[PDB]
Design a binder for this molecule. Sequence first.
Ligand SMILES: Cc1cc2nc3c(=O)[nH]c(=O)nc-3n(C[C@H](O)[C@H](O)[C@H](O)COP(=O)(O)OP(=O)(O)OC[C@H]3O[C@@H](n4cnc5c(N)ncnc54)[C@H](O)[C@@H]3O)c2cc1C
Ligand SMILES: Cc1cc2nc3c(=O)[nH]c(=O)nc-3n(C[C@H](O)[C@H](O)[C@H](O)COP(=O)(O)OP(=O)(O)OC[C@H]3O[C@@H](n4cnc5c(N)ncnc54)[C@H](O)[C@@H]3O)c2cc1C
Ligand SMILES: COc1cc(N[C@@H](C)CCCN)c2ncccc2c1
Ligand SMILES: COc1cc(N[C@@H](C)CCCN)c2ncccc2c1
Ligand SMILES: [Zn+2]
Ligand SMILES: [Zn+2]
Lengths: 230, 230
Amino acid sequence: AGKKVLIVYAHQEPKSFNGSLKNVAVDELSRQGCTVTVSDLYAMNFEPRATDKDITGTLSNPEVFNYGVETHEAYKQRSLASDITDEQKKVREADLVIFQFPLYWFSVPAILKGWMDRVLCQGFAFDIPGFYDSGLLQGKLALLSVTTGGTAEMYTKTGVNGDSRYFLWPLQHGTLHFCGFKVLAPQISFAPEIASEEERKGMVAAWSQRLQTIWKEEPIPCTAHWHFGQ
Amino acid sequence: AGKKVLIVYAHQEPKSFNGSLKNVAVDELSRQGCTVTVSDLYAMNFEPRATDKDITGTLSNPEVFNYGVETHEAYKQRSLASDITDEQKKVREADLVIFQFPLYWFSVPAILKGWMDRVLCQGFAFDIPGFYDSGLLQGKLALLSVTTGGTAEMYTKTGVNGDSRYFLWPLQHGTLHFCGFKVLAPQISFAPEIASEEERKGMVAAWSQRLQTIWKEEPIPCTAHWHFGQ
Ligand SMILES: Cc1cc2nc3c(=O)[nH]c(=O)nc-3n(C[C@H](O)[C@H](O)[C@H](O)COP(=O)(O)OP(=O)(O)OC[C@H]3O[C@@H](n4cnc5c(N)ncnc54)[C@H](O)[C@@H]3O)c2cc1C
Ligand SMILES: Cc1cc2nc3c(=O)[nH]c(=O)nc-3n(C[C@H](O)[C@H](O)[C@H](O)COP(=O)(O)OP(=O)(O)OC[C@H]3O[C@@H](n4cnc5c(N)ncnc54)[C@H](O)[C@@H]3O)c2cc1C
Ligand SMILES: COc1cc(N[C@@H](C)CCCN)c2ncccc2c1
Ligand SMILES: COc1cc(N[C@@H](C)CCCN)c2ncccc2c1
Ligand SMILES: [Zn+2]
Ligand SMILES: [Zn+2]
């Protein structure tokens, strides 16, 4: 063993279904003997905005502000804001990063989008070269554990929302694969708010049970075909 | 014939390529006689986080906080935070909403994601029923004006990033169409950083030129087929 996990958790309410999925993950991975860390973004009041406050000391170009260039240079020069570098250390140490969130507008809640925007800077998460298969977080696993308002049936190719895989593309491919993660199959807990107690319990147990064997999983082929093909 | 436009703008730097695209839109729509409003999110320090500070009234359930439920009720009761209702007024009055932003992780910058999350609440933007074609913002047009780091070639079906339309899905369909907007074709200004100065000037002029006839355009068919093909 000796496996290290970071859970990046984005829900306001400890008693929520998301909260329970997060807690079951902590419980089960802790039981296994894994090293576990949680970034509870709302509790941390995590800053989502990409601004010039993310660089400490003198800017590379104080007259014209380019977030990408400034953060790349700040990473190289150990001059990023401590909230960012605190998260980078957690990611650097992790073998697996689990994202636990409710689907907001076919994507992550803004607080979690901000974590992605600000934490995954050039030089840390990807570079030229070093992206997609050679992304700098290569060797690590990532997994999206998402809850939805809509039902499984709505998230079908011919359903009103389209296939759930369609909304996964920017997250799994554009973000996680880009940074070199192997992407484990998403955990999608459909429509807990209208599910029965029994069904909800089932979904939480599926997740806990899945976690028992998470280290034996094969990553998905994070391709356009997987997301969009038949 | 008396058209109102809201530009929701998400860039930190007034001298940026995004800044120029926003300014030329203001100039050209102003020249046409349109009524124009801009929400400059970074300059506004717009709050992106969905939190219980977004409701000031008595909560429906003060023991277990459900953001969707509480904001829906707060919208009906008029106890939403005023920054949200300020944006809703701008949207309510607009005939066309243009979003001007750099692509961040195949999506919008977090500050703009937060605008979507917080402003487009139930009761205001959609109801149950009252979504997709019957969304509450029906009759309005929306348009994504996006800039990218990657080139046009990279954003094709056989390119490393996949086709550009793939990443539009959560924004155009999952968000805008869901709220009832008709969606005008996106403006994607590819890779301005790589482009020559002449090519950049060309991209800005192309947007201004397109705006001259924007009111004659038809919306796209905002469907899975449009985004993903056969
Ligand atoms: C801004 C915004 C945008 C949204 N966009 C979308 C979208 O694009 N697409 C979409 O489909 N949905 C969308 N939604 C809906 C959203 O995804 C769901 O509301 C969310 O996923 C529900 O998860 P939750 O943890 O908040 O559920 P909760 O309301 O916290 O949980 C549901 C029920 O499960 C119960 N529960 C908690 N723990 C357990 C347990 N251990 N065992 C059994 N029951 C338990 C809870 O008590 C509760 O009764 C959006 C919502 C918002 C606010
Ligand atoms: C957190 C983050 C995530 C990102 N994710 C992605 C992603 O998923 N996919 C992707 O492809 N890219 C991504 N990028 C790259 C990003 O999308 C580009 O950096 C951005 O789109 C560039 O637009 P800009 O306005 O910042 O360019 P600028 O750097 O401001 O513009 C380039 C040049 O244009 C010049 N200029 C300004 N106005 C004019 C004018 N009127 N005429 C001529 N020249 C002018 C500027 O002076 C500058 O020299 C990401 C960047 C960041 C920081
Ligand atoms: C595109 O689908 C949704 C669904 C939402 N919420 C519903 C499903 C209630 C949760 C289950 N009872 C959304 N809520 C807010 C904003 C966008 C939504 C989109
Ligand atoms: C986190 O930043 C990026 C940048 C990308 N593209 C390069 C070309 C940026 C160039 C502008 N300086 C991405 N491309 C694809 C997917 C994610 C990206 C993230
Ligand atoms: Zn991929
Ligand atoms: Zn659509």
